[PDB]
Design a protein around this ligand. Structure first.
Ligand code: FAD
Ligand code: FAD
Ligand code: BE2
Ligand code: BE2
Ligand code: BE2
Ligand code: BE2
Lengths: 363, 363
């Protein structure tokens, strides 16, 4: 006769978003089980996005275009600040950001957040480009995820490898599921979101003591970035292929990325030559984006699913009673290129929805 | 002081092709270690093709266009015949195959192989289509692979999960590697084959005691097939998206596949209605194809790799001595839609190359 918890939650997805949601829910006292295909130990898996990020904090919208985005970014920055002392985050001082025009600098909304924010002289920008410098924060994407996972372990969360094809499979002994499935949200019956889209990112992992972060959007026909991370490693990138699922390495893209990046900062080379760059790995990830922006909202759903709820529902088109429970589905996906830098704020919004839902339905 | 084998081989890839190559090499006495990202237990992994096949024997070329293909298919048929008694293969009697024209029937080259081969009357074909019927063989694709894996275990082969980015990582204590990597052949340094391309296949797994196989290519704008497999399951398919990497389920494609398939044989429905079809799973696999056809050939390679051998070579563009061994790389990939049905013959050609190479180089 043991007192048992009535605060059970399934988190579907183990990328940085499910992990951070899970961690805040667990700290709040929820009993959390994580169900996912891809787990933090799968550091070279291409079927989720989280191993492949920089990951730094680089705002991409105006306050007006991305009010939630900015709120989430601002909150995650404070958290990363708190992680510098133990090394789970790293200052990228004197980051330089180059854009085509004043528009590309997004109203400078974040200037009070990133220290030493200031405009660059045109002597310190590529030709025709405008620029600012500031100090921002970075995490080692796969290690940061494993760190979150350890924190979850200690709070008693559990992990289970599973690939779900229909919602009832996730409502596994719980009446609330957190859906943090990235691109998978499109092909799971009960979610079916056609708006989910990938945005392909190829990068080159480079061995280099280069400690400066440079980003250049001033050339539409060649996005370039250098993002340092702990371990004497930098990530050189350059692609944004919207709707592109190709997982294979483009050899021509290798050269365009390294040339542009070299341009940006020859010290990523052993001798300022393309040929002096010490390549560790060629990488391709697909950012899990969504037309209409990230989806963070709670929905009420009746189970089991019928073919009129989902084109992908299992069994025969004809469905009826055979019970019929109602559960809560809290969406958290389609963060595109900003999942790490928005992750802690997003998880905060997620846990507020869960608190909310439990107050209303589940007791 | 123990006598040790000098017949070591690494098989890179654990799809039906690496598995079958591995099995014949092991039966020949080779010591075989399999290195691969995706293993036979990963039955819902979309990063290799082998879990997703029918898999039946359906020749797709003329003798003139695909001489090796036909040789390999003919050989695999005899092997599958030998597997019927233990259930690792299943007769699909009275298979029906519909094409647009006489051309689509490929010269009837295989008529002595599939029993009871004969033309269909136009009364038994869709409108405007021509057809033959014959008895062919099918295997349960993921279970067949696990079966091969058990046979490998008993012959002492071992398996290890690994994702390779450069050839020297595969030449792990062996001087011969079998490269059976499907699409991965394009992005591994030392192979770099730009000709590798995926061909997307969406299907619907259906619960049904339907035991007949029907295939209809008479409609270019909608390929359709019904392929029974052990367990009261049939696979209904329809896509061939060349160069398409999209791993998400197309809901519109679901309906087009089920309607066409229903057309072909209403008994896949519980009541001959789309709504009576008992859906088990929606699937998407990418067939590992190659412009210029499958590659089965042995190549001699010097290690370590330099950036002039591979655009993707690791380290700095500048490379030299630091040793320099020479090894054998036996290619076996780009089987597209015919990897299972060509698999045993392909593996036979593979093991002959290995025998050859060992006679020449490795002793
Ligand atoms: C090259 C590159 C550069 C980037 N750099 C940065 C950067 O500097 N800063 C920044 O903030 N972000 C960056 N991003 C985007 C960041 O990678 C993504 O926004 C973030 O990883 C997405 O997190 P997620 O948890 O939403 O999704 P995905 O990581 O990481 O997780 C989807 C989770 O859902 C599971 N899934 C869905 N399908 C199913 C199902 N059917 N069954 C079971 N589980 C399933 C998956 O297995 C995985 O567990 C980068 C990405 C890329 C490719
Ligand atoms: C819908 C559908 C229908 C089909 N039906 C049939 C049919 O009826 N009959 C027929 O014959 N065939 C069919 N096919 C094609 C058959 O599926 C493929 O031809 C066959 O699976 C390919 O076998 P493979 O071993 O070449 O490649 P892939 O299965 O199965 O294996 C690639 C192996 O290489 C490993 N790999 C490569 N990248 C790397 C690396 N970098 N490091 C480590 N390992 C790595 C992978 O992880 C995997 O182990 C079907 C396919 C599809 C999608
Ligand atoms: N928004 C981005 C984020 C990262 C890399 C590129 C882009 C881009 O628009 O091209
Ligand atoms: N999210 C980013 C932040 C900075 C540079 C690149 C990226 C990227 O997604 O590619
Ligand atoms: N050659 C094929 C094999 C299987 C399915 C479709 C095709 C096709 O040409 O459309
Ligand atoms: N290889 C096949 C044989 C028969 C029907 C379909 C396929 C297919 O690849 O889709």
């Amino acid at each position: 006769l043991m007192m048992h918890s009535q605060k059970r939650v399934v988190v579907l997805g183990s990328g940085v978003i499910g992990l951070s949601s899970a961690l805040i829910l667990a700290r709040k006292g929820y009993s959390v089980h994580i169900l996912a295909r891809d787990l933090p130990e799968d550091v070279s898996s291409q079927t989720f996005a989280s191993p492949w990020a920089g990951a730094n904090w680089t705002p991409f919208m105006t306050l007006t275009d991305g009010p939630r985005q900015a709120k989430w970014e601002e909150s995650t920055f404070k958290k990363w600040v708190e992680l510098v002392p133990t090394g789970h985050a790293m200052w990228l001082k004197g980051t330089r950001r180059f854009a085509q025009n004043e528009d590309g600098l997004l109203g400078h909304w974040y200037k009070d957040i990133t220290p030493n924010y200031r405009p660059l002289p045109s002597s310190e920008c590529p030709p025709g480009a405008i620029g600012v410098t500031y100090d921002t924060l970075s995490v080692h994407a796969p290690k940061y995820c494993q760190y979150l996972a350890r924190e979850l372990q200690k709070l008693g969360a559990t992990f289970e490898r599973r690939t779900v094809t229909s919602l009832e499979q996730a409502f596994d002994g719980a009446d609330l599921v957190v859906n943090a499935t990235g691109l998978g949200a499109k092909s799971i019956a009960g979610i079916d979101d056609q708006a989910a889209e990938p945005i392909r990112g190829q990068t080159v992992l480079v061995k280099s003591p280069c400690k400066r972060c440079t980003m250049d959007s001033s050339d539409p026909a060649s996005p370039a970035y250098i993002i340092p991370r702990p371990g004497g490693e930098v990530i050189c990138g350059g692609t944004y292929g919207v709707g592109d699922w190709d997982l294979s390495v483009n050899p021509e893209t290798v050269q365009r990325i390294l040339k542009h990046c070299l341009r940006l900062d020859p010290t990523i080379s052993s001798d300022g030559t393309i040929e002096g760059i010490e390549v560790l790995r060629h990488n391709v990830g697909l950012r899990p984006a969504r037309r209409g922006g990230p989806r963070v909202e709670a929905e009420r759903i009746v189970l089991p699913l019928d073919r009129t709820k989902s084109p992908l529902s299992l069994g025969r088109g004809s469905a009826r009673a055979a019970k019929e429970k109602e559960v809560t589905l809290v969406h958290a996906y389609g963060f595109s290129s900003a999942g790490y830098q928005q992750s802690w704020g997003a998880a905060e919004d997620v846990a507020q929805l869960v608190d909310e839902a439990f107050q209303r339905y589940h007791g």
